């Protein structure tokens, strides 16, 4: 019997800063125990200061990104080159996903950018279109390895102030882009050690008011 779905592995991570946002993802593409590509970009600049990644089944992921990029193009045509806000893009993607509610895009989608107040924004989707604005979200193969670490090191969960013994929480101080990138790199380095589908390379897209910037880092190739 024909199975229309597949699993191309991969792991992605989106973090929203105070005035920036990052969307990172490994560059490895796989089927079963084989490597298809050590560098196959998974995070895309979709225009209007929006970055996107649809992780899971790569054919559905490419189709969804392609359709959304197209939606941005037609938004400009239809609405006098108006900039598509991150919240408007999120609602639009819900409809793209839910349109195939009974034959879903087998992907976990994350987008990142800035909201209309210039603050960092990340949105997370399930395969059928349910979405939420989030501060921190890992997706894909090693999401279960990364998110607990992020709860601890970004939101300071289970961390209290020394001497108080659990009475006073560690205060949630804002992180810089350099600080966030360290956590992203350490997240993927750790994931690469313990997850076989994670490795080869790490590509990070950083979004600020100045635009979209890229950073690339090598990961272990075993």
């Amino acid at each position: 019997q024909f199975n229309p779905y597949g699993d191309n592995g991969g792991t992605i991570l989106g973090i929203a800063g105070e005035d920036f946002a990052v969307l990172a993802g490994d560059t490895r593409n796989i089927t079963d125990y084989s490597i298809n590509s050590r560098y196959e970009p998974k995070v895309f600049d979709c225009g209007d200061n929006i970055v996107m990644s649809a992780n899971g089944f790569a054919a559905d992921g490419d189709a969804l990104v392609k359709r959304f990029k197209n939606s941005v193009k037609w938004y400009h045509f239809d609405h006098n080159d108006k900039k598509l806000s991150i919240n408007s893009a999120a609602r639009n993607i819900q409809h793209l996903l839910y349109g195939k509610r009974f034959f879903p895009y087998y992907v976990h989608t994350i987008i990142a950018g800035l909201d209309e107040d210039g603050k960092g924004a990340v949105y997370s989707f399930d395969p059928v279109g349910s979405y939420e604005r989030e501060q921190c979200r890992a997706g894909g193969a090693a999401a279960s390895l990364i998110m607990p670490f992020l709860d601890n090191q970004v939101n300071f969960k289970n961390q209290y102030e020394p001497g108080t013994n659990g009475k006073v929480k560690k205060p949630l101080k804002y992180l810089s882009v350099e600080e966030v990138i360290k956590l992203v790199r350490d997240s993927f380095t750790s994931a690469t050690e313990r997850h076989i589908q994670v490795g080869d390379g790490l590509e990070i897209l950083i979004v600020t008011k100045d635009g979209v910037r890229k950073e690339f880092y090598e990961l272990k190739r075993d």
């Binding site: 392609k66 197209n70 193009k73 045509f77």
Partner: protein, 231 residues
């Protein structure tokens, strides 16, 4: 006369009057100019207002990053045809990862307009279009008539009093074709061309509409104070 009741009827001399009447709507429309060099292609359009309280009707429509047109005649028909061009440009990019050639875009517009001239119930399009673009064979300028006739040109003009601008471009042919790597001078030539079609009125800041596409220039439209530089 007896043969102008619909588009499905030839006259005894082999004319299609409904198509000719559709052509007449273009002549009533406001003047717009098109011209190109080897690096850039320019559209200049005189926008028309209803009165002093009203806005000036937009004349130029973007079809893709590398293509767009200006209109003269029925504006809703231009919207239908430009929408079709947007879709065809888009189909080419999505399916073939290929920017639609300007010449092929002209062929598609011809065929779409033709179907409305041979069938009962329909009507011809009542608008003329000047399509500019930059593709793999350089800069291009097309003139579309709702008869279906599409023509590739160095320069042209359509609308009321377009004959003055067309004669000017016919004189200046050898000069403006050589304006390579200088967008401002090519626009100047277009603004000077469209000036040969003005009577009583002159080019003001909300009157003038300019578009340009070229080698390292996406199709962009200039309106308002962005064209004061050229007035």
């Amino acid at each position: 006369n007896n043969y102008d009741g619909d588009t499905v009827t030839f006259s005894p001399t082999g004319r299609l009057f409904q198509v000719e009447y559709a052509l007449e709507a273009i002549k009533q429309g406001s003047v717009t100019v098109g011209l190109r060099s080897n690096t850039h292609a320019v559209l200049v359009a005189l926008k028309r207002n209803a009165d002093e309280l009203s806005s000036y009707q937009k004349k130029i429509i973007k079809c893709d990053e590398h293509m767009g047109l200006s209109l003269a005649g029925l504006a809703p028909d231009a919207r239908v045809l430009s929408n079709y061009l947007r879709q065809q440009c888009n189909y080419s990019s999505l399916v073939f990862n290929r920017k639609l050639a300007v010449e092929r875009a002209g062929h598609l517009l011809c065929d779409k307009a033709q179907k409305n001239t041979q069938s009962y119930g329909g009507r011809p399009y009542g608008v003329g279009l000047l399509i500019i673009g930059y593709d793999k064979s350089g800069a291009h300028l097309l003139e579309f008539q709702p008869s279906g006739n599409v023509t590739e040109l160095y320069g042209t003009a359509i609308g009321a009093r377009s004959q003055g601008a067309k004669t000017y471009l016919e004189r200046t042919l050898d000069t403006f074709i050589k304006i390579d790597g200088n967008p401002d001078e090519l626009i100047k030539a277009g603004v000077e061309a469209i000036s040969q079609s003005l009577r009583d009125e002159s080019l003001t800041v909300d009157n003038l509409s300019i578009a340009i596409v070229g080698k390292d220039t996406p199709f962009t439209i200039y309106d308002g104070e962005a064209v004061a530089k050229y007035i």
